Design goal:
This protein has 7 helices and 8 strands. By secondary structure, it is α/β, with parallel strands linked by helices. It has a single domain, classed as Protein tyrosine phosphatase superfamily (Protein-Tyrosine Phosphatase, Chain A, Alpha-Beta Complex), CATH 3.90.190. It has an 8-stranded mixed β-sheet with strand order 1-2-8-3-7-6-5-4. Strand 4 and strand 5 form a beta hairpin. Helix 1 runs antiparallel to helix 7 and helix 5 packs parallel to helix 7. The longest helix is centred in the last third of the chain and has 19 residues. The chain is globular. The structure holds [4-(bromoacetyl)phenoxy]acetic acid (2 copies). One [4-(bromoacetyl)phenoxy]acetic acid (A1BHT) binds next to helix 2 and helix 7. The PDB classes it as hydrolase. The entry lists the keywords step, ptpn5, allostery, disulfide, covalent ligand, hydrolase. The assembly is monomeric.
């Protein structure tokens, strides 16, 4: 268990010191899973990447070893709260139906898709394994497109909000931080609007670890900064790695979370 509690001054300077950031980052274990933990035949058709697999203790199981598998993990939130997010790979043609089965099974109210990563949402309507997916409205904003979706399976109807973030930067410099911070804030407000014990929020792009981990880590540290007046990005990254191997994949991503939190701290202090 690693930790470096940052007050405001050290946060601003830490985000701008790439040598210390890479020294710190590359001491965090990736906690990847041994591929021989999943010896099911035909399971490789359900993974985008051979070596990015779900840690077994936190794996989401659907309800046949193959039929119940999805490359997805429950992720703890701020203060260790269980099941605040699900981190998952972007669906492939072979798993689009499993993905929607997961959304239904978990009562997921919000999906966050992080692009600058797949194609699984319908033009108007589509159905998968008993659940009907209807896009009622599309809201275009500067930083994301929000789709208000209805899920129908039998007599039950549910709402769902799908956030498609389009401003993921190639160069992770501080000028590119505001859109991500805005997405984080809009999603956490939507989640509060669901009321007590919000069901898990699904986050993905391609492998479900890099951009995904940046988004979740920022979300966690925003609550930390508001409640405690500090941020601990190292401890947060360590908690995320225990839940799913590889969360926050690159040092550039690690620095980007520091840039976002440095921005948010300035905003809060005015
Ligand atoms: C700090 C960190 O990234 C970390 C600490 C401990 C750990 O092992 C937990 C396990 O599931 O065995 C993984 C990652
Ligand atoms: C965290 C890390 O390893 C890193 C961050 C930024 C950086 O500069 C980019 C460049 O190409 O100069 C190098 C390494």
């Amino acid at each position: 268990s690693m930790s470096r509690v940052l007050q405001a001054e050290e946060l601003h300077e830490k985000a701008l010191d790439p040598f210390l950031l890479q020294a710190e980052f590359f001491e965090i274990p990736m906690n990847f899973v041994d591929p021989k933990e999943y010896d099911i035949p035909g399971l490789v058709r359900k993974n985008r990447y051979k070596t990015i697999l779900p840690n077994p203790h936190s794996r989401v199981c659907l309800t046949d070893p193959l039929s119940s598998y999805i490359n997805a993990n429950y992720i703890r939130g701020y203060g260790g709260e269980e099941k605040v997010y699900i981190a998952t790979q972007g669906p492939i043609v072979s798993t689009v139906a499993d993905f929607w089965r997961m959304v239904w099974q978990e009562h997921t109210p919000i999906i966050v898709m992080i692009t600058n990563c797949t194609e699984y949402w319908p033009e108007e309507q589509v159905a998968y394994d008993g659940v009907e997916i209807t896009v009622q409205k599309v809201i275009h904003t500067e930083d994301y497109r929000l789709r208000l979706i209805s899920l129908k399976s039998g007599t039950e109807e549910r709402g769902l909000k799908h956030y498609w973030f389009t401003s993921w930067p190639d160069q992770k410099t501080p000028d590119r931080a505001p859109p991500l911070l805005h997405l984080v804030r809009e999603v956490e407000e939507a989640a509060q609007q669901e009321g007590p014990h919000c069901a898990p929020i699904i986050v993905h792009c391609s492998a479900g670890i890099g951009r995904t981990g940046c988004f979740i880590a920022t979300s966690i540290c925003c609550q930390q900064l508001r409640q405690e007046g500090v941020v601990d990005i190292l401890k947060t990254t360590c908690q995320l790695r225990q839940d799913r191997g590889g969360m926050i994949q690159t040092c550039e991503q690690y620095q980007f979370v520091h840039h976002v939190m440095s921005l948010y701290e300035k905003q809060l202090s005015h």
